[PDB]
Design an enzyme around this catalytic site. Structure first.
Site, PDB file in Angstrom:
ATOM      1  CB  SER A  49      -0.964   0.030   1.174  1.00  0.00           C
ATOM      2  OG  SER A  49      -2.074  -0.801   0.910  1.00  0.00           O
ATOM      3  CE  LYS A  52      -4.441   2.012  -1.079  1.00  0.00           C
ATOM      4  NZ  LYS A  52      -3.703   0.718  -0.985  1.00  0.00           N
ATOM      5  CB  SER A 298      -4.779   1.537   3.038  1.00  0.00           C
ATOM      6  OG  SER A 298      -4.088   0.912   1.980  1.00  0.00           O
ATOM      7  CE  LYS A 410      -1.879   4.059   2.849  1.00  0.00           C
ATOM      8  NZ  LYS A 410      -1.828   2.684   3.431  1.00  0.00           N
TER       9      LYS A 410
END
Ligand SMILES: [Co+2]
Ligand SMILES: [Co+2]
Ligand SMILES: [Co+2]
Ligand SMILES: [Co+2]
Ligand SMILES: [Co+2]
EC number: 3.4.16.4
Length: 466
Positions: A49, A52, A298, A410
């Protein structure tokens, strides 16, 4: 102090949970620009993720915090005498937060617009994007779940987290021996149900399973749910998110006193129409607002939808090919070196993605000084924060430590892949870091990631609460 920090990280990295795992670790002081630590910073690894991050930055650059998305309803010409119309088109242009409420609000407008009957068919137009629903290398076994939801321009979002292309499936226990009660949520009347589930005795093992067999639009429920068991809920994807938006709008219209004699189906506005009537329309929040739910939890659907929006803005094409190139381009305009970067999708779900810990930190420094630095950092999940919309996927981590409410980063985890990249704001210096682990065989090395984040928070001048 510096020397101690390095040794401490080296030690933490000595964890047996990282055996056979290549780990890219980079730490840099945003202020001074000094390189506090680096290990395999140039090593190409799957970011999960964390990918992202690159998509989010690209989105702010190409669309901008100001950007927002729209949804329209159109007829060839406004209604008249008997307030009738032929075909009605629901046109989506990438709003990832389109709720059923929004649809109901629009079903109302169409009614207030004077429409009472839709003599024709009701079409859902999602042609703003191509029809490529899933990324080429996504595992079909992940398809029944929200994170693998089909991508479409017209799609309804569930809950306050805006989960797209999914419906909420509920399973309520009956009396022992009797079939379990299954509710398909929004997909009711849309998807087919194959309920083989049964209420087990009270105190029995819960062996229930909700699934959508690959290649079908059927929600199959099997297994046994004990009678004394608390009703179960789950999110399952559906086929053609647009056909579902159309189904719900179909029901929304009927609820607003508008009859529909036709059938619900996919199809774009003829173009043959020089002046179609826009009976209704909705506008979502701006990108800066939509960023929060996207990054906090996410949301893959959002990431992918963003890429294609970027593909629309930069090339007039809601395509991964276009959007991806647009993302890579935008990152360059931001001053990021996309050398060792490989973009296969926007969410990071794809095993085809590749990045290097150095590139991530690079993107962190730049993003940190871009005009949208604030709205950007504010979307990142905060370490150990109960409130879901603030803690995000980090709410249950590093609580009661120097990182609590300090580390902004993140997350990203898949089998054999895990990553934690972000900022560590502090009086002893503004820090940017990146940790990407690939190869470990057991669970994700989250404790190792935390351990490092917590030591960094201390190095930045933070103490654990007491
Ligand atoms: Co814009
Ligand atoms: Co819910
Ligand atoms: Co229904
Ligand atoms: Co909205
Ligand atoms: Co503190």
């Amino acid at each position: 102090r510096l020397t101690e920090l390095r040794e401490d990280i080296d030690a933490i990295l000595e964890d047996p949970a990282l055996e056979g795992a290549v780990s890219g670790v980079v730490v840099v002081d945003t202020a001074t620009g000094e390189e506090l630590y680096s290990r395999d910073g140039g090593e190409q690894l799957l970011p999960a993720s964390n990918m992202k991050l690159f998509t989010a930055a690209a989105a702010l650059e190409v669309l901008g915090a100001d950007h927002s998305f729209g949804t329209e309803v159109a007829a060839e010409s406004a209604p008249g005498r008997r307030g009738e119309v032929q075909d009605l088109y629901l046109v989506g242009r990438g709003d990832p937060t389109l709720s059923a409420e929004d649809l109901d609000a629009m079903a109302a407008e169409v009614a207030a617009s004077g429409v009472r009957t839709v003599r024709g068919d009701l079409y859902a137009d999602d042609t703003w994007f191509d029809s490529e629903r899933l990324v080429d290398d996504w595992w079909p076994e992940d398809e029944p779940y929200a994170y693998s939801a089909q991508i479409s321009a017209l799609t309804v979002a569930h809950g306050e987290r805006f989960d797209t292309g999914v419906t909420e499936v509920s399973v309520t226990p009956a009396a022992e021996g009797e079939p379990a009660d299954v509710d398909l949520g929004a997909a009711e009347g849309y998807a087919e149900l194959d309920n083989r589930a049964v209420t087990g005795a009270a105190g029995s093992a819960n062996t229930l399973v909700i699934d959508r067999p690959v290649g079908t639009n059927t929600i199959a429920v099997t297994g046994s749910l004990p009678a004394d068991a608390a009703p179960v809920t789950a999110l399952r994807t559906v086929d053609e998110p647009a056909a579902l938006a159309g189904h719900l709008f179909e029901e929304a219209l009927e609820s607003n006193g508008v009859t529909v004699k036709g059938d619900v189906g996919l199809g774009g506005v003829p173009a043959d129409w020089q002046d179609a009537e826009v009976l209704a329309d909705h506008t979502s929040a701006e990108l800066s607002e939509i960023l929060v739910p996207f990054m906090k939890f996410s949301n893959n659907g959002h990431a992918e939808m963003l890429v294609k929006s970027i593909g629309q803005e930069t090339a007039g094409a809601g395509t991964w090919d276009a959007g991806l190139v647009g993302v890579e381009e935008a990152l360059s305009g931001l001053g990021v070196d996309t050398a060792g970067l490989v973009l296969n999708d926007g969410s990071g779900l794809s095993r085809g993605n590749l990045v290097t810990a150095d590139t991530v930190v690079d993107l962190l420094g730049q993003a940190g000084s871009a005009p949208w630095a604030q709205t950007w950092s504010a979307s990142l999940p905060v370490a150990g924060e109960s409130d879901p919309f603030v803690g995000g996927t980090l709410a249950n981590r590093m609580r009661g430590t120097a990182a609590e409410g300090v580390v902004e980063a993140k997350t990203g985890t898949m089998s054999g892949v895990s990553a934690l990249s972000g900022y560590v704001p502090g009086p002893e210096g503004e820090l940017a870091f990146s940790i990407v682990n690939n190869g470990h065989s057991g669970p994700a090395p989250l404790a190792v990631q935390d351990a490092i984040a917590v030591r960094l928070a201390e190095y930045a001048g933070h103490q654990a609460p007491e």
